[PDB]
Amino acid sequence: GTGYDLSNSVFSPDGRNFQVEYAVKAVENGTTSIGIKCNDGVVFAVEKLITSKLLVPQKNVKIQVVDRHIGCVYSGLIPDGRHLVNRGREEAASFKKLYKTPIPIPAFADRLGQYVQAHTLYNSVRPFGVSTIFGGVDKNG
Amino acid sequence: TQQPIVTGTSVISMKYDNGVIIAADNLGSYGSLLRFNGVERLIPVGDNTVVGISGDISDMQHIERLLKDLVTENAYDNPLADAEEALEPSYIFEYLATVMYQRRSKMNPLWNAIIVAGVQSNGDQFLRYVNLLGVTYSSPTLATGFGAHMANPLLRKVVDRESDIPKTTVQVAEEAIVNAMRVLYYRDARSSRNFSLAIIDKNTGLTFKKNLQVENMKWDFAKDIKGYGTQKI
């Protein structure tokens, strides 16, 4: 039939999840942002549209830090982006508190991944309207 | 409700014309056993604040993590983290004070005596105390435990009242501190000869001296002391 795109956790006949795909649309419509992996670190950059001369220059920082060694930048619904970072900070904090060592980037990546993947499991939630570029330096580069 | 196990003794401090000084030996006792010796009990938060802690060491280590976390947190979404919006001694204290009181109020205290020393953004000297009961207060000089009884009397001779601060130089002050540390080594059976000392000057910043030692002790007269009354040899 049809209407497989009205509820979030629903599988369409061809095995897709339209709600997630529609989220991507919000992402693609957002500002452009990138990440470059150099040989001893990573660089993050992003486009900040001057919607008006009224915006105080330099005053609406987009890139965010998690812990003291991780950087995060995203495109799409900014508020969704902040929400995900808040979770990341909690996750990083929880990890350090028990293992002492600041969270390895690969471990942090899955923490964010499992969390985001979680928002595609129920119709009582909406998927994240952002794609996020993030990384840092750890025990392995 | 608990009872301390591994503990640190006195934490002494005072304030001079430009900043404040704080010190504490490097011992971690276990009852009467002077068990651990490389214990730093002076926690620098940023470089305008130094937190000296005495009491249960496990709780101290815990308060240390809380402080590092505070620094990390303050940095989040804070473009002025190391400028207008950096941690002030007064913030670090108010936080610690809050935590300390909540814990005693829940009948599970952080068994410590804490002194926060530092310099406010406007150059003002900051020096305040808080203990496991949540009690707090300020004075030109502050010391925990054993140091409250022996160090204060000495330090107060240098800065007895407010008008004495501007007349006291870092040399005079640091001297008083170092001498007090010696006196404490003479009469506190839970003290160590090694200690750390830190200066927070509104001009020179934070000077953190590790591995000091009590020097120039008088022990020679000990040879003339024989018996406990009538013995002659």
Q: Where are the domains of chain B?
A: 1-233
DSSP code, position A102? P
Q: Which of B161, B201, B43 is nearest to B112 (CA)?
A: B43
- Which residues have C-beta within 8 Å of that of residue B211, sequence separation ≥ 6? B194, B196
Q: Is A65's CB within 8 Å of B75's CB?
A: yes
- Distance between CA atoms of B184 and B217, rounded to whole angstroms? 12
Would you please indicate which residues of A are annotated as catalytic (active-site) residues? 31
Q: CATH for B1-233, among 3.20.20.30, 3.60.10.10, 3.60.20.10, 2.120.10.30?
A: 3.60.20.10
Rg (CA), chain B: 19
Sign of the dihedral through C-alpha A36, A38, A42, A48: negative
- Which residues have C-beta within 8 Å of that of residue A66, sequence separation ≥ 6? A72, A85, A88, A89, A92, A108, A134
Q: Which of A124, A85, A90, A89 is nearest to A7 (CA)?
A: A124
Structure-solving method: X-ray
- Which residues have C-beta within 8 Å of that of residue B99, sequence separation ≥ 6? B63, B66, B110
CB contacts of B69 in chain A (<8 Å) are 93
- Distance between CA atoms of B30 and B47, rounded to whole angstroms? 31
Q: Which residues are bridge partners to B17 per DSSP?
A: none
Is residue B158 exposed (0-12), middle (13-18) or buried (19+ Cβ within 10 Å)? Answer: buried
- Distance between CA atoms of B203 and B135, rounded to whole angstroms? 31
Question: What is the separation, in whole angstroms, between the first and last Cα of chain A?
Answer: 50
Pairs across A and B, CB distance < 8 A = 12
Q: Which of A137, A20, A127 is nearest to A83 (CA)?
A: A127
Sheet holding B141-143, edge to edge: B141-143, B12-15, B19-25, B194-201, B205-213
Q: Is B69's CB within 8 Å of A61's CB?
A: no
B225 φ/ψ angles, rounded to the nearest 5 degrees: -95, 110
B132's tokens? 């496991």
Chain A, 1 to 60: residues with Cβ < 8 Å from chain B are: none
Q: Is A67's CB within 8 Å of B69's CB?
A: no
Angle, helices B146-158 vs B170-187, to 10°: value is: 150
Is residue B117 exposed (0-12), middle (13-18) or buried (19+ Cβ within 10 Å)? Answer: buried
Question: What is the separation, in whole angstroms, between the first and last Cα of chain B?
Answer: 52
Q: Which of B65, B72, B79 sits opposite A61 (nearest CB)?
A: B79
> For residue B23, is it left (φ>0), alpha (ψ between -120 and 50) or beta?
beta
- Distance between CA atoms of A101 and A95, rounded to whole angstroms? 8
Resolution of this deposited model, Å:
2.9
CA separation, residue B228 to residues A74, B98, B186, B189, B233 (Å) = 80, 51, 20, 21, 11
Query: What does chain B come to in residues?
Result: 233
Q: Which single residue is written with the structure tokens 């928002």?
A: A119
CB contacts of A67 in chain B (<8 Å) are 72
Chain B, 55 to 74: residues with Cβ < 8 Å from chain A are: 65, 69, 72
Is residue B160 exposed (0-12), middle (13-18) or buried (19+ Cβ within 10 Å)? Answer: exposed
